Write a protein that binds this ligand. Structure first.
Ligand SMILES: CC1(C)C(N)=Nc2cc(OCCCN3Cc4ccc(OCCc5cn(CC(=O)N6CCC(CCN7CCCC7)CC6)nn5)cc4C3)c(OCC3CC3)cc21
Length: 194
């Protein structure tokens, strides 16, 4: 029943005439308002990336990898402000952020973003919670073109956060991160829509 979404993939990646690097990951989603755009979680890397696979010249040798193995309660986390600790070099540190949603295909994972890096991250937050590294704090425009200017940077609104309807995901044409914005906050004050 799977085509590309839900599959593990491998491909090469090449910027300029630089070296080709090999990447392995899991395709999380094909974006409804832009079916060319796939969201990808690369093994060992924590951000969610968007690539327009069918036209990005930097992608080479795309292949589907076989699954090596066959394929609730923590829903209460969704929408919660959190403090997420991590090991630095010894010292431990923390970023504060917001749990956005459960991740699409990798069941036990969660979308999360942070004030110090307001792009889309993905973590096994229930594990982190059990290890004492996640403190829980006490408690449309999709498909529209967006620009901000800070040269004229253009993109598209690809998702609205169900748990927090003023929060949206934006894919800018010039980058492969997924940007998260709360449209009522200062971080969004230079975004304009069409
Ligand atoms: C142990 C584990 C898992 C757990 N169980 N829980 C956690 C929790 C962690 O923290 C939670 C808070 C959020 N954290 C903190 C934090 C602090 C510093 C950070 O620094 C990043 C600086 C950096 C990184 N790059 C690389 C880069 O940009 N690339 C370009 C794009 C490339 C892919 C796309 N391409 C490929 C081809 C197609 C396009 C990849 C390379 N460049 N600069 C980042 C963070 C995130 C946690 O954090 C990580 C550890 C270091 C602190 C770990 C865990």
């Amino acid at each position: 029943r799977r085509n590309i979404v839900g599959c593990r993939i491998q491909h090469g990646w090449k910027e300029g005439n630089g070296p080709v690097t090999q990447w392995k990951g899991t395709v999380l989603d094909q974006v409804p308002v832009n079916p060319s755009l796939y969201l990808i979680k690369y093994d060992g890397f924590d951000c969610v990336y968007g690539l327009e696979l069918n036209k990005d010249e930097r992608v080479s040798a795309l292949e589907v990898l076989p699954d090596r193995v066959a394929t609730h309660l923590a829903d209460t986390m969704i929408g919660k402000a959190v403090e997420h600790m991590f090991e630095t070099d010894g010292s431990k540190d923390e970023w504060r952020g917001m749990v956005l949603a459960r991740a699409p295909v990798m069941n036990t994972w969660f979308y999360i973003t942070y004030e110090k890096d307001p792009v889309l991250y993905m973590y096994q937050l229930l594990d982190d919670y059990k290890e004492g590294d996640l403190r829980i704090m006490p408690d449309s425009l999709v498909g529209k073109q967006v620009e901000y200017a800070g040269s004229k940077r253009t993109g598209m609104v690809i998702h609205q956060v169900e748990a927090k309807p003023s929060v949206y995901f934006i894919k800018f044409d010039d980058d492969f991160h997924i940007y998260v914005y709360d449209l009522v906050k200062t971080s969004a004050e230079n975004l304009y829509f069409q």
